[PDB]
Design a protein around this nucleic acid. Sequence first.
DNA 1: ATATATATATAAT
DNA 2: ATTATATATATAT
Lengths: 591, 405, 386, 199, 351
Amino acid sequence: TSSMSKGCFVFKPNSKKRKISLPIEDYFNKGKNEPEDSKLRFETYQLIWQQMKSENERLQEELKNLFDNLIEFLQKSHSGFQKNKLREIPTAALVLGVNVTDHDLTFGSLTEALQNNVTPYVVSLQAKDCPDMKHFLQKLISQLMDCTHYSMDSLSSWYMTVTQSPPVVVILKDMESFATKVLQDFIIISSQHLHEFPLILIFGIATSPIIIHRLLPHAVSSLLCIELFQCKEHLTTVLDKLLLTTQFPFKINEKVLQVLTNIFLYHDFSVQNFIKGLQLSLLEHFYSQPLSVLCCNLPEAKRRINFLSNNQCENIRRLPSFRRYVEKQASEKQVALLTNERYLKEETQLLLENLHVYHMNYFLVLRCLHKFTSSLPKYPLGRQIRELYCTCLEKNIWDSEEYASVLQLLRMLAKDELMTILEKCFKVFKSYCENHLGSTAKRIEEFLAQFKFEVLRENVVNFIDCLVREYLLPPETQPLHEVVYFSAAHALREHLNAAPRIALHTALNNPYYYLKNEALKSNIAPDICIAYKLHLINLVDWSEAFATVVTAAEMNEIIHARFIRAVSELELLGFIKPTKQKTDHVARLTW
Amino acid sequence: LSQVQRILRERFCRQSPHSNLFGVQVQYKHLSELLKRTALHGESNSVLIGPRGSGKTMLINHALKELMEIEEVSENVLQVHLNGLLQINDKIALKEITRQLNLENVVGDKVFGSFAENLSFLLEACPVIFILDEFDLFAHHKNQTLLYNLFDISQSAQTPIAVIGLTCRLDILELLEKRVKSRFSHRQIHLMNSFGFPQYVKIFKEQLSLPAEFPDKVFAEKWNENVQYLSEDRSVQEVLQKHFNISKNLRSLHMLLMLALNRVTASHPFMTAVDLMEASQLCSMDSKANIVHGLSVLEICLIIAMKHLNDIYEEEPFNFQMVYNEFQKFVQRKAHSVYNFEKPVVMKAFEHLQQLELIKPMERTSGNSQREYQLMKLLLDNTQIMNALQKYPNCPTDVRQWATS
Amino acid sequence: ENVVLCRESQVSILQSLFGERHHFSFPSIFIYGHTASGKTYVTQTLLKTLELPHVFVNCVECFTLRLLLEQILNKLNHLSSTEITCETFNDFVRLFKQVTTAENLKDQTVYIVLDKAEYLRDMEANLLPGFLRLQELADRNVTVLFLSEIVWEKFRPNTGCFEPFVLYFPDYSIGNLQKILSHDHPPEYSADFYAAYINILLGVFYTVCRDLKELRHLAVLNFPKYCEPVVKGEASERDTRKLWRNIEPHLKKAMQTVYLREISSSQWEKLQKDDYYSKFILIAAYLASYNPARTDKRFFLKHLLGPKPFPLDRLLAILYSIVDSRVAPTANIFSQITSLVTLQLLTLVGHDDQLDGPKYKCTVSLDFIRAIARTVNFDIIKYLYD
Amino acid sequence: DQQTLRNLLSKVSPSFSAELKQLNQQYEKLFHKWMLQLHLGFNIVLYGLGSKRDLLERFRTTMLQDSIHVVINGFFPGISVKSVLNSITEEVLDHMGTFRSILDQLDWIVNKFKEDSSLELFLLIHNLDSQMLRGEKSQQIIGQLSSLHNIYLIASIDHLNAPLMWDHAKQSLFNWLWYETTTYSPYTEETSYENSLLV
Amino acid sequence: SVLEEARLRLHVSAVPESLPCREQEFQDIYNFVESKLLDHTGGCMYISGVPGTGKTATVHEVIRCLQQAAQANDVPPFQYIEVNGMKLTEPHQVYVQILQKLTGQKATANHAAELLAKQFTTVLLVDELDLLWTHKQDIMYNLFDWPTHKEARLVVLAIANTMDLPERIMTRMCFQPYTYSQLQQILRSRLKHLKAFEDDAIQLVARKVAALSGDARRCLDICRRATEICEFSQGLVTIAHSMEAVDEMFSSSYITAIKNSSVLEQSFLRAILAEFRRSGLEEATFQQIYSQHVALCRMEGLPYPTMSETMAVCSHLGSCRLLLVEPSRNDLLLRVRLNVSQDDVLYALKD
DNA sequence: ATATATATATAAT
DNA sequence: ATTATATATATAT
Ligand SMILES: Nc1ncnc2c1ncn2[C@@H]1O[C@H](COP(=O)(O)OP(=O)(O)OP(=O)(O)O)[C@@H](O)[C@H]1O
Ligand SMILES: Nc1ncnc2c1ncn2[C@@H]1O[C@H](COP(=O)(O)OP(=O)(O)OP(=O)(O)O)[C@@H](O)[C@H]1O
Ligand SMILES: [K+]
Ligand SMILES: [Mg+2]
Ligand SMILES: [Mg+2]
Ligand SMILES: [Mg+2]
C-alpha cells in the first residue's frame, strides 16, 4: 500500500458517494468543555485576524514617499522618447532590503501605482522560469499580450498594433538569481530597437548596489542609465497600530513579546514572520483558554457575559487573578460571588470595563512619556516606542533604578526645549479623542498658558512622575487580565525556531530523560545510544567495542548484527561518511 | 577590360568547368571507365576519392559532361546530387531523391513500410547515377541507413546504380561499419597533388591566360605574350616559391590571382611584378600582431605583466589579482607616477581583453566566481609580444624597457 | 548625410573587390577589427551608396538558427518587390534560389552582410561552413561578409572549410581621431575653437581610451564646462591658457566618475548646470575560507590565491568560539547560513551532498567584512594573520 | 555479517519497555493541536532522535481517515521530487498525460489547486533529509507546493544538519511548527537499504 | 568477346542456384525446418558469423526448396515473411510490418503488438537482430518468446554478426569464415566453363583475402577489378594484374599522402617527431610543437613562420586526419597526437 | 498524447 | 575538458 518498486502511493475515495465534505472547525473541538463556546471562539479569532491583516496592509501602503520619485523618473526619461542616436536605456535600481519575503508585496504594491498613472503595460519576470534566451522572451511576450517562435520583431509588431505612445515597464524581482548570459544578451538587442520599442528596466536589488558591476561588465554597463533609489522603522509603526491601539482587543505578554522581537532583530529582519507570530498566538490563545470568547469588542464582551453555561461560570471563578481579587474583599462579598452566578455576572461586566478603561488610560500616557523621552539626549530607557513598551510591561519603571537617572536628566532642560516638549504632549491628548484623562489635558494647557524658571520647572518635572505612577502599571496586577492576555513563552518560541541538533545531542547522551526508568544517572541503552557514545573509528575495532559493551549489558551472532544495524542507523544520521585512508576514519560531530 | 574581368572572375571565384587537368590522368581514367561501365551495363560500383581544394568537384563534372555528349547516354540517364552539409538527416535526404528524380508527383500520398520500400518504388518507374558530395558527414548519422541502402541496392538489385563518394578523410574506412564495408568495393581514386614546383610555374602561366575564342585578337596576342614575359621574371618566382612552400593547392593560387587582377583598370592595362608582390602581402598577414597594435596604452601594460608572470611561475594559470599586483610594482617603482590608475578602470582593460579573446578561461563557470580571482590563461605567445611592441606607433619609453627586463 | 573620413584605401579595396554587377566576387570576406574602426558604418554606407540590394543582420539578435534564416529571406523579398517559412539549412538554400530569380535580381551581385560574427559558431557546427561556401552551393552570384572582432584562426572549424580573404581595418591614430571629432562642429562657435577643445581632451584621455565611441560621448558632456569662461567674460577665444586651465582638473574627475559610469551622464550634465547572527556567520566563513587550518587552534581556542573551500564542521566551530555566549543550534541559524548563499555572499562548491555536504566559500571582499566587524565591535584583523 | 542474518535474528529484547510505552500516548495528545494548525496555513516538521515514522503512521490511522492523503518515503532509494509531482498530477487530478518540465508540471498543479477550493490534499513526508530530496530545487518545488491554502504537510527530519535545505525565503514558504517528538523505537525500515552498502 | 562474360559472372548480384562449399549447413537448416513444419510445432533458431559467410543466400535457398517441396505437395503449404533490421526506419516498426504482411489491416505499433500477441504455418525471417535492440529489450524478448507457444506454430530464424548476442537478453548454429580451399573452389566455380583466368592469379587473390579477412565480396571485387586492369593492357589475366589490383584495394594511402606534402607541413611533422623524442609522451601542446618548428625553419632556411599561418598548416594536416587535434576554438592549447605511427612517418620523410 | 532522438543545462569525473 | 544525467525541443507514432 505504501511499499512497491515505485514512488507514487495516492489513495482515492472513488466509486463511493462521499462527495460531501467536512467543514472546518470540526477539528478545533479537541476537548469537550462546551460545544458552542468553540464556534464563537473561532469566529472571534477569524474577525480579529482579518482586521489585523487589513490594518497591516493599509499601514504598509502608507509607508507613497518612494513611489512619487519613481513615477516622476518614469515620466521624465520617457519625455526624451516623446521628443524623438545611441540612447542609453534608463534604468531604476530599487534597493530593497535583506527581507526577501517582504519583496512580494513591495513589488506587488508598485504595480497598480504605475498602472494608474503613467503606463498601461507593466509585466514581471523571475529567474526561476527564465534560464535561457528562448524562455526569457517567451514569458515576456505572453504577459505583455493580456495587459510560433516569437522574437524581438514580434514585440515591435505588437507595439505598433496596439498603440497606433506609452512606455513599457519591465521589472526584474530578483536580479541576483538571473544568469549572467541572458542579462548581457537582452540589453544589447533591446537598445538597437529603442526607436520602435521604448523599454525602461527596473531591477530588484537586495544587496548593496555593487552587484551590477559583478554580473554586468563595463562594455554593457555603459548602455544603461543607472539611477539609485532606496525594516526598523516599519516594525515600530506596525507594532503601534496592531497592539498599542485599543481597537484590537487581543494583547500579548512581555515574554511572548520578548520571543517575537528576538527572532526579528537577531536572526532575520522580516515583518511578515512577525505577522506570522501573532497569528499563531491569537490561535493559541483562543484554544488554551475556554473563556477567551470575552476577548472581543467591549459592548459585545458584556453581551457574552449575560448568556453563559454554568461550567463557564465555574471557569470564571478559578482564575488566579479572580482568586486574588475575592481575597482582598470583605467577608460577605466572598460568599456573594462564589455561590450565585447571577451576582458573578454583574461583577464581571464591571471588571471588563475596568479592564478596558485602564487600557485606554495606559498607552495614551505611554505616548506622552515618549515625547519626553525621545527629546532627551543619550536615551537611557530607549529611543524607540517598541523599546519603551518592553521595559514598563515587564515591571514598573520607577521601581527600577534606571528611571531615576532619567528624572535627574529630565530636570536639566532649558526653556526652549520644554516649549517643544509640552507642545507635543498637549497634541497627543487632542489626537486620541474620548480619552479618559480630562483634568490632565487642561493642566498641560495651563502650563503652556503660563508662558523663577527653576521652581516652575520642578513642577513640570513632577508633572510626569505622578502621572505614570497612576497609569503605568504591569497588567499581572489587574483582575480578569487573562481574558485578553496570553503568556506561553516556550510554546511560541519552539514553534517558530527550535534546535534539532540538541534534540539529537541530548537524547543520545542521556537515554534517561525520555525514559524516566533509571536508564542513566551520571552499558544498558538502545542500540544507537551505545555506538554513539563509544566514538564520542576503524570498523573492525569499533565492532569489538560494541561487542564488549552490549554483552556486558545483556553461537548467537546477535551482538554483531546489532552493530551492523546501529551504525547504518548512524550513517543515515549526519555522523558517518566512509573514507579510504583507513577502513573508516571520520568524525563529523566534533562538538 | 570588361570581358577579361568577366572570364577570370568566373574562372577563379565561381569555379567552373575548364578543360585543363594537371596530374590526374589515371585517376580520370579509372573514374571514366567506372561510370562508363555502370552507365552502359548493369554493373554497379562504389568509390571513395583528397584534401581540400584538390579538384574533386572539378573532375567529376568534366566526366559527366564528356559522358553526356554521347547521344544514347543523354536520352536515358538521370542524375541526383546530394551534399553532406545540406541534408543532415535521412528524412531530409529521402525527400531530395523523390524531388530530383521528378517523381514527387508519382509518389504522392502513397505510404511505404520501410526506407528501402520507399527507395524501391522510386527506382521501378534506365540507369541512375548518385553523386554524394562531402561524404564523411553522411557517415555520422545514427545507423548509416542511407549508406547501407544505397550499397545494398547496388550490390544485389538489377537496376544499375553508381555511388561515387567525395571526402577529405584519409581514414575514411574506419568511420563506416563492418557491413557497409563488406558491400563497398574498395576502389580508391587518389587526387593527391603529386606535381612539382616547375609544374607549378607552368600552371601559373596557363590559368592566367585568355582563351582563343576572344574576339579582339591583337590585344589577346600581346596579353598572352605579357604573361609569358612575366612568367620568366625572377621577381614573381620568389613569392610563388613562398606560396608553393606553404601549399600545393591551386585554390590558394586562385586566391592570389584575383587580388593581383584587382589592380588592373583602363589606366593600368597590363599586370606588373609589383602587383603580384602587393598581392602576396595581403594573404600573408599575421592576425594576432595586428590586434596588439590597436590595443590601448593601458591594455599593453597588462599583457607585459602577464608575460612576466609566465616566465617565473611557468605554465601555471593566473587571475586578475595576480595581474593587478604585478602592475602595481611597475607604476610605483620601475617607471614613474603617471599610469598609477585606480582599480575600477583596470577592470575595463581586463574586461576588454577577454572580449577580444586574447585571454581564455582555464575553467568556464559563469556566476560561480567573481569577475576578479578567476583563473585565466594568456593565449598570446612570447614571440608575438616583443615584435608587436617594436611596431607600436608611439610606445612609451620605459614600457618597452620593462618588457625586455 | 553620411561621410567616411580617413577611410579611403580600405574602401577602394571594397569597391574594387565588388566590381560591376554581373561580375562574380569572392564567396566570403571576413572583416575583423576593434571596438570602433568603422566596421558597421563604412560597410553600411558603402552598400547603401552604390544601390546594391543588401541585407544587414545582427547575429546576437537572432539567438536561434531558425530566427536568422527568415530574417535574411524576408528582407530580400522586400528588395525584389508575404511570409516564407524555412526550418533547416537545406530549405534555406532551395528558397534562396527561388527569391533571387526575380527580374531585378537575376544578373546582380546580392550581398548578405553579417555583423557580430563571434556568436554564429555557438549556434551550430554546420552553419559557419554553410555561409562560407554559399556561392558554390546556391550558384546565384553571392558574396557574404563577416563583421567580427576576433581573428580568423579561432573561427576555423576542425574539419576545414573554404578560406575567406582576410581584411583589416586599421586603428585610428592620435591625429586620425582628431580629424573625425573636429568635423561635426557646434555652429555657434568657430572651427578652431572646437579643435583646441579636442586637443586638450585627448591629452588626458588617449592613455585609457582609443575607442571612438567613448571619446565622442566624453567630448559632448564636458563641452559646456569648457565654453563657460568665455560666456562669463573672464576669457576669450584667443586666451587658450585660460581655456585649458579651466578644463584641466575637471577632466581628471571625469575619468574616475563619468568614465566608469559611477555618476551617470544625466547627473553630470545637471551638476555643472546647477554649478545579528547573520553578521557573525559572514565573519565566521571569512575566517574559515582565508585562514590555514593549522593555525586555527592558536587564534581561537587561546588573501591572494583566493578562497579555499572549508567544511561546515570547521565553520560552526569558529562561530561558537567568537560569540561570547551560549548559542543554541536553532533551525534559523542553520537556515541563515544558506540565506547568504542565495544572496551570493557565500557559495557552495562541489554539490556532492547538501546536508552532509560541508563545502562552502566566503565570496566577499575584505572591505565588506571590516565594517560589519566594526558594527558589532569585533576585530577581524586580530584573527587573520600575525 | 550478511544482511540475510537479521531476518532470523528477531530476538532482541527492549530493556526499558514499560517507560517507552508511555510516550506514545503523550504525543498522541499533540495530534489534535497539529490537526488544528494544519488547516490555518501552518506546516509541521518533527525534530528528534528516533524513528518518527511510527508516530507519523499512528497519526494517519487516528486522524486522516476521510481525506485524500499521500504518504512520501524519502528513505526509499529510487525516490525523486519528480515522483512526488507525478503522484499528484496523474492520480489526484485523474489526469493521464506527460509534462514537458518539472516546473511546467508544478505550474499545472498549483494552478489547478488555485482554480478549485474543493480539493484538500495531505502531504505526509516521513523523511525529508534523504539525499535524493536534499536538493534546493527539490525543496523549492516542495515549498511552492506547500504555500497554498488547500494542501497540508507533516514532515520529519533525521539529519544532524537538516535545516541547510531552507533559507529565509523557504522558511517563509513552509510555515514550520517545530515539535519535540523523541520516541526511542529504532529505525527499522529506513536502515534496511543502508545496511547493504557496508559489511 | 571473352572478358565481358567474366564481368557478368563475377558480379556479386549473380548468386548461383547451387552454392558450393555450404552444403552441410544447407542440409542441417533444411532438416531443422522439416522437423518443425510437418508436425505443426513452433521453435526458434539463431545464426551468426562474420558478414561474408553467405547467410542470407543459403537461407533463401532453404526457403526456396521448401517452397518447391510445398508446390509438389510433400509438405503442407506455408506463408512466408522476411524483414531486415537495417531497412526499417524505427525499431518498433517490426510489428506494423509483420501485421501488414500477415493481415490486410494496418495500425499503429502498439496496436500491432497487441494484435500480434493475440494472434500468437508461418515462417518468420529476421535479419539484423542488433538494431532491434531497445533499453526495454522488449522487441528482442517477444521475438524469441512468441513462437514457443502451441497457438503460434511459428518458426523464427535470426541473423547477426556477433555470436555471443542471445545471452545478454537473459540454438546458436554458426557459420565460419572461408579459408583457402572453399574460396578457390568458389572462384573457379563461377568461371567453370570460360578460359579467362590463370590459376596462379586465382590462388594469389584467394590467399591474400583469406589471409586478411576471409570474405567473398572482397574476392569478387578484386577479381573484377583485376579483369579491368588486364583489359587496359591489350587475352589472359596474369599474376601481375592481380598483384597490382590487390595493392590497389588493400594498400593504405597514409604514407603516400605524407610523401606528396608541402615543405612546411613536413617540417611541422618533423617538429612533432622531435618534440615527442624530447618529451617521450603522446601529448604535446601547440606552443611546444611551434617552439621546435621555429628552430627547424631557422635551420632549414625557410622564412620565419607566423603563428596564424602555422595554425592553417596544422588545421590542414588535421583535416586530412594525419593528426588528431582539438577544434581550434582554443588556440595555443591544441594538444596533438600522431594518428599515424612514428615508423611510417620516418619511412615517408626519409626519402 | 506517447515515445524517441537531438539539443542544451547541470552535475560528476 | 569530457562524460553522464536531467531536461528542452523536435519529430515520429
Ligand atoms: N590538377 C588540377 N587541374 C585543374 N584544375 C585544378 C587542379 N587542381 C586544382 N584545380 C582548381 O582548383 C579548384 C579545386 O576546387 P574544386 O571546386 O574543384 O573542389 P575541391 O575544393 O577540391 O573539393 P572540396 O570542395 O570538396 O574540398 C578548382 O577550381 C580547380 O579548377
Ligand atoms: N570614417 C568615419 N567618419 C565618421 N564617423 C565614423 C567613421 N567611422 C566610424 N564612425 C562612427 O563611429 C561609430 C561606431 O562605428 P561602428 O558602428 O562601425 O562600430 P563597430 O566597430 O561596428 O562596433 P563593434 O566593434 O562593437 O561592432 C559610428 O556611429 C560612426 O558614426
Ligand atoms: K499548509
Ligand atoms: Mg567540391
Ligand atoms: Mg558593429
Ligand atoms: Mg545479410
